Write a protein that binds this ligand. Structure first.
Ligand SMILES: [K+]
Ligand SMILES: [Mg+2]
Ligand SMILES: [Mg+2]
Ligand SMILES: [Mg+2]
Ligand SMILES: [Mg+2]
Ligand SMILES: [Mg+2]
Ligand SMILES: [Mg+2]
Ligand SMILES: [Mg+2]
Ligand SMILES: [Mg+2]
Lengths: 140, 100, 70, 141, 307, 221, 184
RNA sequence: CCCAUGAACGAGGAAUUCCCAGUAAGUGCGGGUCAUAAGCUUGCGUUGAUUAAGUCCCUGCCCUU
RNA sequence: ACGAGACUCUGGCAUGCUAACUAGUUACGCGACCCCCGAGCGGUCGGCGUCCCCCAACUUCUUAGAGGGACAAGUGGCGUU
RNA sequence: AGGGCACCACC
């Protein structure tokens, strides 16, 4: 029984990928990875598989459960969780060399595939509609 | 015996944690099966109000808040033993509710 | 800016003048030594003092320093 | 093996609506040609057979998430209400439409009342939806 | 016999703080690091790389300060600045046991000869004796060092079972393992101490630290034998398993002394306004032909004893 | 049954009203504060507990009776006790009341303020500030400030290092305002001052001078 | 595995003729991405936007005016359809067309108005202003017209790449450089 | 709430406001007010940029002679 | 010496610690449905249950306590250095 | 006369 559970975050969206020894299945909330909406950003989800090849994923089944945030943030959380889950599975049940090479590929393409973006919404302050904008000022 | 649930509530985290630790230490000394302190989400009561008593000047606001922290402890013990354990000195500001 | 105030600078100078033999060029060891030998109320202040201690130790190894009399 | 979650949901809804209309045992209210589906709508639905589409959508939602009542359905089909010169706000769907859809689905025996309240799919309804999903997958392939 | 540079191991992302080798597996070594991981290296000795990272042991919250390998080569014992010790199953790379009780950074760990006991020295100025199940059998704090306990070691000779400890109070102490009571107290050094090592025969104990002097003590006699001069701060001391040598990591360089002649055999200097990387740890191979040295540039260097 | 939010707000409101009532009732008796420990025990801190107790406890019994009647406690459930303030000179409320009654007694403003300042400083405070505002001399109003020692104004440490009190004095010509601020000394024990030191104060341990060994010496234990 | 934008357009054959702009038009190699949507922090530091892929910079500049603020999925779809239209109309690589349009639209000399004085224009500002002019021309062509925004963007890019005077960006660049010459 | 009625307004002169990163802007949701109740305010998330890393030209404030 | 800074709250990190039927995960058992084909250690399930007479392990996700973590600390350049 | 600072100044 070889499995890992690795999360990825984007804003308030959090996706946990369970990656176990398998035949190459990838699901998000029980749906095929190609069925996740919006499909404008389908390549964002497919990027880990396109970069690493289907051969790396051929030996694992990955099921992703995602919640919170919005549509785009969930897309980014899913892709980050898939990449981090594959890296963790490789570093735990395969050699360190394979983990290093796949991690290098992912990092070279995009660092957010492995490292979470820490940006969060800034608090509103009184005297304006938002964090920085102020209400219009009149003089006469 | 009976299953005893102790709910502790406070506005002071440090005193709340001290009381919880003392209760768990007492339960351990009495050799009781005690579920650790389950921490409920902290409640933040907020009141935002204008600073000025009149209506003049730059519209500045005070953001007052109160934080309520809640803990749960589960015990399998007789009621008398539970009361004896809860009879220890309780720090001020901590409200304890025992249910059987 | 990263200008350290007189609190940090004076604490670092006194620490170096009193415990020069236990200090070195390693920030983390200096931080442990500072927290062992001084009461510094906050972790951030401890880190700033240890960092300036490390900087001054490098300067002292490179040559004499006016502020510190060892 | 094909289940609902394996197919495109819009295509599945269209196929299931066509299946319900072809079966023709679904009870349709007399006022389907007069009403609009919510107070935040401006016009009645463009599709004359909107009732079958709504029933298929409701059955799919019950498949995905059982125990939903009329209030949950009105939340599902709610949308943005524009208020003229005033800001827009969320608004719920028509309770009569949701209730009639649920009752018609119960009449088809695809839907039964849940023990804890609300509605759920019967095993027959689950089987019908999975067969429709298989047909959709076959058509796509 | 002059040692030459053979290769480098480039896995770590922080200072290499300790290197461990075992006689059972000549192709496997361990390296602890400040990147909070312990790398198990498989030695290929190929043209491309001398060795590559085989496995990474993770679970420490702070710097890993010291690592040792069990006699059978199946388990590893590590200490860390997070104040805990960990026992690792090398086959799976998971932690089998956690040792808690030190209130500050754990600076040194050591296995007994039969691996039935574990000794740990920490910044809390306390020495702790444990069993393999993670229970602190004994805690020496009354007669212990007045400063950080920087290194603790076990004697390999079971005839006189003793523990050798060195701390930042410039003292070397000997403890009777039977009762964990002080036996000998050495007051030679003038600066804080970084390391104490014991000869394979158990007769010799070498101590080194800030003052740069490597002082030899007779464990049987209980007296100071002599003193060797190292230019820089001594970071690590190691006795050659077969040759009558003493190896010291003096600043950026490595000095080997022939104890028979008390003279320098060789000086291992890395080929270069920045200070050179410091050597932090030394470990001889099982056969004694290969010396592994850890440095502050996140590298391990391999020196081969060449005729 | 009542929600926890409402329960905590209600307990706070009860303490606020009780403190206000005791402030108005026992101002001349040196009242400084009240502690409510749940029978419900109510501890009244005062400089002159004899006047709080009254003739054979008559006044304290009256206070217990009115408290019980107003707040709806069951008869006999609430008990009131009186205690003396440990360091009268370090209580801002006590000093403000003392200054208020000195001013009501016709004492000169400068004399009364300087007397209070000297008493506070002799009590062990790091520093103090006394501000008296109003129609001190003539119709035009002004404020006189008397400061001594160290005083901090900004940041979190003000919350636990500075004790503040504001009081009103009803004179013939109008109201005078009294503000008393006392910077408490650092007390590791925690009795007269905060245990936590000032956050920007770094205290460096003086090393113990030691003699380095000239020659290696070994001892046997 | 070669990476093609939208899975259709390759970057290997794209050539940047102007050597001054070669360091400020990120289009190939490490800058080849499947989509013009990276959610990167290119505005964190100065000059870092030079690393942002040029297609994504165009997509960002299409999110105007206010009513379209933040609708990056819509602008990505617009750019995809515009590239499809460009390929149909010209037979060329849409990336090559975009690069040529930017090169031809960037003004090389401007006036600073300190009476005005002529000054040179840095390559980064050249790229910035080229993108701004192209997007502005497309938007103004599409406003109050049955022609869609994707078609207007495709026409603007094609004309700018050809250097034709039918391009809003080309006309604005010519006016700016003429004024700079006058104030020289 | 329903049916019906279907005005100005086709991007706004002189002038002028706010703002640099999860920010501006778009978008909705809570709290306060509240029997009835948000075009206000105070918070929250969601989508998410262009431009700049400079200056004393304007408006001010400050320092020296 | 006050003010600035320090400070308090907040945001971001921890597969390390503490530990949860008013949070969950994974595993297993039962059940529903799809695929005869390639019917399985299959797929989907916010369907039920597993300290709660007795029947399962854990804390990644959630909550919230303790501690850690960042110091212009490392390298290069400029600077009176 | 010279020198600083600020999207409640400008660029
Ligand atoms: K149009
Ligand atoms: Mg906003
Ligand atoms: Mg809706
Ligand atoms: Mg201060
Ligand atoms: Mg401040
Ligand atoms: Mg109002
Ligand atoms: Mg956790
Ligand atoms: Mg203005
Ligand atoms: Mg302007």
């Amino acid at each position: 029984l070889q499995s890992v559970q690795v999360f990825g975050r984007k804003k308030t969206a959090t996706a946990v990928a369970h990656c176990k020894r398998g035949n190459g299945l990838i699901k998000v909330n029980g749906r095929p990875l190609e069925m996740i909406e919006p499909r404008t950003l389908q390549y964002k989800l497919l990027e880990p598989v396109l970069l690493l090849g289907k051969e790396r994923f051929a030996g694992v089944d990955i099921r992703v459960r995602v919640k919170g945030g919005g549509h785009v943030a969930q897309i980014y959380a899913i892709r980050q969780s898939i990449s981090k889950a594959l890296v963790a599975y490789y570093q735990k049940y395969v050699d360190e060399a394979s983990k290093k090479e796949i991690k290098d590929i992912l990092i070279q393409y995009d660092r957010t595939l492995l490292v979470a973006d820490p940006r969060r919404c800034e608090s509103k302050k009184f005297g304006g509609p938002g964090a920085r904008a102020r209400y219009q000022k009149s003089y006469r | 015996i009976h299953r005893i649930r102790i709910t502790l509530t406070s506005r002071n985290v440090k005193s709340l944690e001290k009381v919880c630790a003392d209760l768990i230490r007492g339960a351990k000394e009495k050799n009781l099966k005690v579920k650790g302190p389950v921490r409920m989400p902290t409640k933040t009561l907020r009141i935002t109000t204008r600073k000025t008593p009149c209506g003049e000047g730059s519209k500045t606001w005070d953001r007052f808040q109160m934080r309520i922290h809640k803990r749960l402890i589960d015990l399998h013990s007789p009621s008398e033993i539970v009361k004896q354990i809860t009879s220890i000195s309780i720090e001020p500001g901590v409200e304890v509710e025992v249910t059987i | 800016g990263r200008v350290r105030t007189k609190t940090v600078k004076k604490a670092a100078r006194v620490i170096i003048e009193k415990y020069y033999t236990r200090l070195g060029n390693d920030f983390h060891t200096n931080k442990r030594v500072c927290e062992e030998i001084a009461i510094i109320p906050s972790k951030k202040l401890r880190n700033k003092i240890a960092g300036y201690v490390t900087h001054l130790m490098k300067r002292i190894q490179r040559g004499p320093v006016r502020g510190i009399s060892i | 093996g094909v289940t609902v979650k394996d197919v495109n949901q819009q295509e599945f809804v269209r196929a299931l609506a066509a299946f319900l209309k072809k079966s023709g045992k679904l009870k349709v209210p007399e006022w389907v040609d007069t009403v609009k589906l919510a107070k935040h709508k401006e016009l009645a639905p463009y599709d004359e057979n909107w009732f079958y589409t709504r029933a298929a959508s409701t059955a799919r939602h019950l498949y995905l998430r059982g125990g939903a009542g009329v209030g949950s359905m009105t939340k599902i089909y709610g949308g943005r209400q524009r208020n003229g010169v005033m800001p827009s706000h969320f608004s719920r769907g028509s309770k009569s439409v949701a209730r009639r859809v649920l009752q018609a689905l119960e009449g088809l025996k695809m839907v039964e009342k849940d023990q804890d309240g609300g509605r759920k799919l019967t095993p027959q309804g689950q089987r019908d939806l999975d067969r429709i999903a298989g047909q959709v997958a076959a058509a796509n392939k | 016999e002059q040692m030459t540079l053979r290769g480098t191991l480039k896995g770590h992302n922080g200072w290499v703080t300790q290197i461990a080798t075992t006689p059972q597996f000549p192709d496997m070594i361990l390296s602890a690091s400040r990147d909070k991981t312990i790398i198990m290296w498989k030695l290929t000795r190929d043209e491309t790389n001398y060795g590559i990272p085989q496995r990474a042991l993770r679970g420490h919250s702070h710097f890993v300060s010291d690592v040792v390998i069990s006699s059978d080569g199946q388990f590893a014992l590590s200490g860390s600045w997070d104040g805990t010790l960990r026992l690792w199953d090398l086959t799976t790379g998971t932690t089998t046991r956690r040792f808690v009780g030190h209130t500050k950074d754990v600076l040194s760990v050591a296995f007994s000869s039969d691996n039935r006991q574990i000794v740990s020295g920490s910044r809390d100025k306390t020495i702790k004796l444990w069993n393999t199940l993670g229970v602190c059998k004994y805690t020496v704090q009354d007669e212990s060092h007045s400063e950080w306990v920087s290194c603790v070691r076990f004697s390999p000779n079971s005839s006189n079972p003793i523990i050798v400890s060195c701390g930042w109070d410039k003292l070397v102490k000997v403890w009777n393992l039977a009762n964990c009571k002080l036996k000998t107290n050495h007051i030679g050094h003038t600066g804080y101490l970084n390391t104490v090592t014991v000869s394979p025969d158990g007769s010799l104990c070498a101590s080194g630290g800030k003052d740069g002097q490597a002082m030899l003590w007779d464990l049987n006699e209980g007296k100071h034998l002599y003193t060797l001069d190292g230019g820089d701060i001594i970071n690590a001391l190691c006795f050659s398993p077969n040759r009558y040598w003493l190896c010291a990591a003096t600043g950026p360089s490595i000095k080997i002394w022939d104890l028979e002649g008390k003279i320098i055999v060789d000086e291992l200097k890395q080929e270069v306004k920045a200070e050179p990387p410091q050597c932090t740890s030394l470990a001889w191979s099982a056969d004694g032909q290969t010396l592994f040295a850890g440095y502050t540039d996140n590298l391990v260097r391999v020196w081969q004893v060449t005729i | 049954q009542i929600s926890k939010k409402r329960k905590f707000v209600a307990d706070g409101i009860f303490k606020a009203e009780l403190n206000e009532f005791l402030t108005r009732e026992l101002a001349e008796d040196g009242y400084s504060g009240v502690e409510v420990r749940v029978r419900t025990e109510i501890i009244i801190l005062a400089t002159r507990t004899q006047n709080v107790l009254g003739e054979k406890g008559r006044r304290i019994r009256e206070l217990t009776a009115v408290v019980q009647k107003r707040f709806g406690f069951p008869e006999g459930s609430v008990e009131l006790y009186a205690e003396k303030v440990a360091t009268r000179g370090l209580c801002a409320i006590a000093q403000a009341e003392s200054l208020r009654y000195k001013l009501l007694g016709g004492l000169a403003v400068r004399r009364a303020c300087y007397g209070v300042l000297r008493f506070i400083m002799e009590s062990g405070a790091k520093g103090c500030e006394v501000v008296v505002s109003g129609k001190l001399r003539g119709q035009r109003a002004k404020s006189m400030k008397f400061v001594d020692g160290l005083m901090i104004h900004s940041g979190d440490p003000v919350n636990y290092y500075v004790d503040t009190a504001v009081r009103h004095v009803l004179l013939r010509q109008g109201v005078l305002g009294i503000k008393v601020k006392i910077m408490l000394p650092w007390d590791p024990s925690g009795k007269i001052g905060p245990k936590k030191p000032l956050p920007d104060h770094v205290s460096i341990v003086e090393p113990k001078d030691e003699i380095l060994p000239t020659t290696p010496i070994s001892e046997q234990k | 595995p070669d990476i093609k934008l939208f899975g259709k357009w390759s970057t290997d054959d794209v050539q940047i003729n102007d050597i001054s702009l070669q360091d400020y038009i990120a289009v190939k190699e490490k800058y080849a991405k499947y989509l013009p949507h990276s959610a990167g922090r290119y505005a964190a530091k100065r000059f870092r936007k030079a690393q942002c892929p040029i297609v994504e910079r165009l997509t960002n500049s299409m999110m105007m005016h206010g009513r379209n603020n933040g609708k990056k999925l819509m602008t990505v779809r617009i750019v995809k359809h515009a590239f499809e239209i460009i390929h149909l109309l010209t037979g060329e690589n849409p990336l090559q067309v975009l690069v040529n349009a930017i090169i031809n639209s960037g003004p090389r000399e401007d006036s600073t108005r300190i009476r005005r004085q002529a000054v040179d224009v840095s390559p980064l500002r050249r790229v910035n202003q080229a993108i701004w002019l192209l997007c502005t021309g497309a938007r103004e062509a599409a406003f109050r017209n049955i022609k869609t925004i994707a078609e207007c963007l495709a026409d603007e890019l094609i004309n700018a790449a050809k250097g034709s005077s039918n391009s809003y960006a080309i006309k604005k660049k010519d006016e700016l450089e003429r004024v700079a010459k006058s104030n020289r």
